[PDB]
Design a protein around this ligand. Structure first.
Ligand SMILES: [Mg+2]
Ligand SMILES: [Mg+2]
Ligand SMILES: [Mg+2]
Ligand SMILES: [Mg+2]
Ligand SMILES: [Mg+2]
Ligand SMILES: [Mg+2]
Lengths: 898, 898
């Protein structure tokens, strides 16, 4: 066969509902380090004087007013990527109608009846148009809902703009797509850079550019250049590029590039080539589409040839074969996938689960390994008890005040310890410390040393550096300790005593953060990580972050649903083990991050499968573990809401984040929970399994029934002297079946189907079609024999009695058989269809019965049915239902339902 | 007027759906200390030899098999009170059919149309029967649902019985109502005594008979009497009476009395007289019923007299007046109340809120003060951190092992500290302690000393008494302390040091429990509370009980709903204040239990209104505070799940308990939550407000519309020369209106209505009826003028056109006006009725329109309507809806909706 390139009958869904958005962190590799005239633009913009910067982008310090912002947006486009913009509704309608089969059905309708029989080609074209409108309405509604959902959780930026008719400025939180060039924004800790920026002003601004320049340490970004030569746009200290995060400090900057013109946007990724590699969902949809095309190409030519030879009307035989084939079209797939999944995605939104792209639902129900941190998900993130003590265990007010200085004057992201220390200090002492101490510098947090320092001063003679961090890291750089009010050298005896005391505290679930301080002579230069030396250890703060009340039932439900929860944490091994024990998780033997640095990929992939808790992990370790956990066909989900969780979120088969996360965590995620809870995640997983099961059932039943109709036509058309059913009748039958099937997205799903992670095999559809097609053909042939002999529709002159006689059987059975094949159990007593499906089935059956008796029947070439036919019809339908119910068991035994 | 005794037209609901159960704790007062032949029976039963006890009750040691238990149940009745047995369905159908208006209607129908006009009386009787059937079906379904709900949470008993064909025994948990006399049960801690019992065997069995004998201290019940003279059935140490709890120990006893024959059941309460005093809900229902009777008695005689004088047919005028009056019958109140409340009670069951009696819903939505303990509701009942140390602060293994002995060998109710100590001790040391030590005696917990002791022994030479309890109570009875391994006298310096250290610990939210041990020479006699003297203080255990993750949002929602949460706790004020601060509650200034002992009732009632946290409370203090919190018309709810919370649950306006509570706590409660959570309680309160609002709306709309119809008849009957509508048509109109109103229980309620605690005024119904009745009468008179002149129904010969002309207007407006006078807002845009109500309204309107055109119209004396009438009908309906919508505002301003 092959000839896959020749087949262009498949219409792919737009690559925003499916497939992930490009995240600007596609490694440090670049296409010849960007092209000229783009690097030159950045290099000129970096050192351009601030005075003439205002004229270049038509910007004023006040900001931008409305008419100006629409003018800038029109001139420079919108702050998006080429693939994130929706096509106009008329283009969507046209691309739905120009389907290579909707066209032929209209042309063959024109050709067959053009000479001397009009109103028959027109009605066929009208049926084609009605089917096209139904498909287009379903897809348009579902894409509108999906696009609304994706825009519900979108990274925002704080801009000046101009609010109030008066013309006053403000600070609006607007979606990052609305940023036009020459716009003024302000940046704080945790905000991702929304576009290429020119730093107007900034204090202690550190940005994590690891995505672009590949360096983990945050880089200071100044208002004016303080480095001698630039020679490179990516390292100029006065421009911030899109896709990088702000670690600490504050800034106010100007947007210079936007959308495609952004560094990452053009020639450093995204714009280069396209989405060459499709994900699992797109591959499965393509496989199903190719299977349907193969079925049609095998069957329809034979149906054409048989009737052409038998009846000598090729222009009508071809139309008849195409009309029976259109039931097996691939164009159902865009309508089924979009309508069924977007129904789930909306329903998940009422469960505090926002789905950014539709295909993620497949992973969300298929996930069997869930990697997450212990803080916030297992623990409460609010610490109830805290003790600030010195090395001797006595409570110390100096430790609390030293920690308060660091917590108050740090500009990084807020922490639970920071919140506790700011709340744990009384108002009077806090006011005295604030008035008596002023900030001079800040050395932010990085994982190489795992500390955080703040340099303050009470005068202009000496400065005090106060750094707080995990106990060892602090003890590594401490040379003296403050014991009993005296500064005494920190010998090894005190080292081992402190270590064992803090290990005893850790085994109780208490996290310990040590605090160190130093006095230095006043200096003008910036402080650097080398200044964290010969410190004086003031003491440590031991605090308890208790586990959530709902963590244990959520973990039990997750395990009952087939999901293996794995804890990836950068905290201590003892605290993590205690937390795991308290919530009911089995920590087993713990694996620290230092252990896996010397392991091979095979060794680590084999170890991670039997290891539940990983401790002392750097973000690189988390990403590597998540990557190697997909080794044996597992679908891995990573849940994280941190600055450095973007690679881990992007590397997992599904990334889950929280509405309160940092900007880069929400950008890289596929699912956004409105509250950080494992129970919400479990219920969402259970509900997404239902959505995927409903989608599969939709495709499965439609394809099987339509294959049965095509087989019925193929086997019995040769013996008849006329078409078993007029193609107009077949088009009406398919349209009325689709109207009924509209309510399948709202069906009920057995708890048996969604009890374990779902595995989707597109080749199973062919087996289901082959098994459940001829069952319909048996009763179709029985109906043919009924109308031939019992009702004497033996000649073409009385063909209309035959054809209509099949029509009501064709539509009613195909509509009824849904309630038999939708479940593996016995219907109407064990598993029952949802009320919308019941109502739609009843309505479509009534319409199909009443159509031959309606005034339209003459126009549709349908003849009224004698009353002696209805008992036969009921017998046929009941026999078909009973036979399929009795035969379902064999399919269950040999292959299985799920 | 008065003559309230004469009015027996009111049919009260059965006193199980409304009103509380007896709760065998009705003080210590008795009716002459019970009657003779009951006290004598108990006295003879107590001292009767165990050998001959088996023949008396036809009981075997192995238990009772089936046929024997049904025989005993038939002979002795069922273990219930006379007010808890439902009446048979046929008796319920008779009482629903024999009400004076269903009898007078039938009798007048026979009288008026018996002579020469049969099939007119029969159809009227058939309409009466159909109305009775509808009412009976609604009430029967709703009482069945309510009785099923009350049986879901019922105190159970553990019985031997017989299981399976073999004849082997087990231990079944059967509802206490199934207990027949001469049944063998076993009792553990926390089990209430289900019937009068004879103790067969007992291991350290203590029962709290504070309800019966009035003494707070638990007393020891033995297998054989160990006291010289009994002289009193209530103080014999070998019988346990119903309504008392088991504090500690284990036992196996025999049931000797059951149901009424129980000491409490007969002549000691719940038997003499009856429920003389009705509660608030019953009083309100009676007031509404009396208002409806007053309306009918004022109006219907005038309607009879006018038509009797005008048309000279008294036997028909009386029937017509009664037919218009029956719309205002109080017999709908049993159907309205039972059907609307039960639908709520069922809906609460899916929200983990079981309602034991329907009227409690009224209180549940009317609650504005909620009194709870801090443990379990505000805090988790599991403790995350525990430190067992000595007085010097060093960790001590002896303290942990001493606490483990007490926790393991105590037979009382389990505690969070007991669970932690049993889990906090390693397996090896635990098994070593279990093998090395054996239990001898136990001194249970009581609030006078607030300690609990266990006497064990490692040999037959000396015994060790290990008591554990709150710090002061332990320190009161301690004379020595184990310091640095030496037993040193406990001087005042150590007392102050320990007090300040433990006060520092309690300000952190850490509860401190001290442990004391003593060595005594071996002795045969039982140990007594006195034996707790000159103890040796081993140390204390400080543990953290963390607040729940969901307590703060639940408290904020409760405050937003208008409920004032007050904390009644027996713990320290420092720990309670810290817990309140953690969850966001404002403790204010705390009031300890010792402060309120000297206060007067007025002083304590005034103080409790502005006090949020009450600490160091005995159960008597809790009951007194809850009683005095209802002083200014507040509705008080008490939530508790303890042994001593029965008086406080019974004294509150509503009592809430948990499914895992003790037996007496579930018996005294009105609401049972399936999980102990404040969020569940808040959502249940919100949804119960909806149920009560729906019930009030039901009554209000029905009464107002039917009053409007009666007024329309009263004003315009004199001018017409015939009845404005035949009474058959009026009965059909009322029946079809009731069919529509069936779906009101499922209506939607605006969030504005249920945003504050509900206050129900039965006199408001009269104002609503007076305001909204004549609005219907205006358009009824307009319809009369229409049919008189526009349609020329001027004579009796053409009366049928007139009457039917009103009929469709009468039914359709009455059915439509629901969607206008159900909300204070504008309908269909700002507030919408529920889909069941929409469907029922449409169906009833369709039936009313189609009835005059149906073949039944001739049988019902209805004439088909000309098509020129329908535009006038739409005009009348639209004008009525618009006028009532515009006029609703005046009722809102002058009186108000809620
Ligand atoms: Mg932001
Ligand atoms: Mg600096
Ligand atoms: Mg078929
Ligand atoms: Mg029990
Ligand atoms: Mg004893
Ligand atoms: Mg009316």
């Amino acid at each position: 066969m092959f000839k896959e390139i020749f087949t262009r009958l498949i219409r792919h869904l737009p690559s925003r509902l499916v497939h992930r958005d490009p995240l600007p962190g596609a490694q440090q590799t670049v296409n010849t380090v960007v092209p000229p005239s783009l690097s030159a633009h950045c290099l000129k913009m970096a050192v351009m004087p601030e005075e003439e910067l205002w004229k270049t982008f038509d910007t004023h310090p006040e900001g931008l007013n409305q008419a100006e912002v629409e003018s800038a947006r029109e001139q420079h486009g919108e702050n998006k990527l080429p693939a994130q913009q929706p096509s106009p509704w008329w283009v969507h309608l046209w691309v739905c109608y120009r389907n290579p089969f909707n066209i032929l059905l209209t042309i063959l309708g024109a050709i067959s009846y053009a000479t001397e029989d009009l109103f028959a080609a027109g009605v066929i074209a009208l049926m084609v148009a009605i089917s096209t409108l139904l498909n287009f309405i379903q897809e348009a509604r579902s894409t509108k809902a999906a696009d609304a959902l994706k825009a519900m959780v979108s990274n925002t930026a704080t801009v000046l703009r101009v609010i109030n008719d008066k013309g006053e400025n403000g600070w609006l939180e607007i979606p990052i797509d609305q940023l036009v060039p020459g716009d003024i924004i302000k940046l704080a800790a945790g905000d991702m850079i929304p576009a290429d920026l020119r730093i107007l002003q900034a204090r202690d601004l550190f940005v994590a550019q690891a995505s672009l320049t590949g360096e983990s340490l945050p880089v200071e970004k100044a208002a004016t250049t303080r480095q001698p030569e630039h020679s490179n746009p990516l390292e100029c200290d006065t421009l911030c590029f899109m896709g990088t995060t702000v670690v600490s400090g504050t800034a106010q900057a100007m947007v210079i590039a936007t959308g495609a013109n952004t560094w990452f946007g053009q020639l450093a990724g995204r714009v280069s080539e396209q989405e060459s590699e499709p994900n699992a969902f797109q591959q499965g949809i393509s496989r199903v589409s190719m299977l349907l095309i193969r079925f049609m190409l095998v069957m329809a030519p034979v149906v054409l040839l048989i009737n052409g030879y038998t009846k000598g009307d090729w222009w009508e035989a071809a139309l008849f074969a195409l009309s029976v084939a259109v039931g097996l079209t691939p164009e159902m797939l865009p309508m089924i996938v979009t309508s069924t999944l977007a129904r789930g995605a909306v329903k998940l939104s009422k469960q505090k689960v926002i789905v950014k792209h539709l295909d993620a639902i497949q992973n969300f129900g298929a996930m069997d390994i869930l990697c997450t941190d212990k803080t916030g998900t297992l623990t409460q993130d609010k610490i109830v008890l805290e003790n600030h003590t010195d090395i001797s265990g006595k409570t110390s007010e100096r430790v609390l005040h030293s920690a308060w200085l660091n917590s108050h004057y740090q500009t990084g992201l807020k922490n639970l310890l920071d919140t506790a220390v700011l709340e744990g200090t009384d108002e009077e002492s806090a006011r005295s410390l604030a008035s008596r101490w002023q900030k001079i510098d800040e050395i932010p947090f990085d994982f190489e040393r795992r500390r955080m320092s703040v340099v303050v001063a009470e005068n202009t003679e000496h400065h005090q550096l106060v750094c707080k961090g995990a106990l060892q890291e602090i003890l590594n750089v401490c040379s003296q300790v403050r014991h009993n009010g005296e500064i005494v050298p920190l010998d090894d005896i005190m080292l081992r005593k402190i270590k064992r005391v803090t290990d005893t505290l850790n085994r109780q679930g208490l996290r310990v953060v040590a605090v160190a301080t130093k006095y230095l002579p006043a200096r003008e230069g910036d402080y650097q990580r080398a200044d964290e030396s010969d410190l004086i250890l003031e003491g440590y703060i031991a605090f308890l972050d208790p586990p959530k009340e709902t963590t244990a039932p959520a973990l039990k439900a997750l395990k009952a649903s087939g999901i293996t929860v794995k804890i990836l944490t950068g905290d201590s091994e003892l605290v993590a083990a205690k937390v795991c024990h308290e919530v009911g998780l089995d920590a087993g033997e713990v694996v620290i991050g230092s252990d896996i640095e010397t392991l091979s990929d095979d060794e680590l992939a084999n170890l991670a499968q039997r290891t539940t808790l990983f401790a002392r992990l750097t973000p690189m370790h988390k990403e590597r573990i998540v990557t190697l956990l997909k080794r044996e066909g597992h679908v891995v989900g990573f849940m994280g809401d941190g600055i450095n969780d973007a690679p881990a979120l992007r590397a997992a088969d599904i990334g889950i984040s929280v509405d309160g996360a940092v900007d880069i965590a929400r950008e890289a995620a596929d699912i956004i929970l409105l509250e950080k809870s494992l129970m919400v995640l479990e219920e969402g997983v259970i509900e997404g399994r239902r959505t995927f099961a409903n989608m599969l059932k939709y495709i499965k039943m439609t394809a099987s029934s339509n294959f049965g109709n095509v087989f019925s036509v193929l086997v019995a058309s040769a013996f008849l002297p006329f078409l078993p059913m007029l193609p107009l009748h077949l088009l009406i039958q398919n349209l009325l079946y689709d109207v009924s099937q509209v309510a399948i997205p709202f069906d009920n799903v057995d708890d048996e189907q969604i009890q374990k992670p779902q595995r989707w095999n597109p080749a199973d559809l062919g087996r289901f079609m082959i098994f459940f097609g001829p069952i319909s053909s048996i009763f179709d042939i029985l109906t043919f024999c009924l109308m031939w002999w019992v009702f004497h529709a033996n000649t073409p002159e009385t063909q209309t009695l035959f054809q209509s006689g099949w029509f009501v059987v064709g539509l009613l059975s195909q509509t009824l058989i849904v309630h038999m094949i939708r479940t593996r159990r016995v219907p109407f007593i064990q598993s029952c269809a949802s009320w919308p499906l019941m109502i739609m089935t009843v309505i479509v059956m009534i319409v199909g019965i009443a159509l031959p008796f309606s005034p339209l029947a003459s126009y549709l070439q349908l003849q009224a049915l004698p009353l002696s036919y209805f008992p036969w019809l009921v017998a046929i339908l009941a026999g078909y239902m009973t036979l399929t119910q009795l035969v379902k068991g064999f399919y269950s035994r040999r292959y299985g339902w799920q």
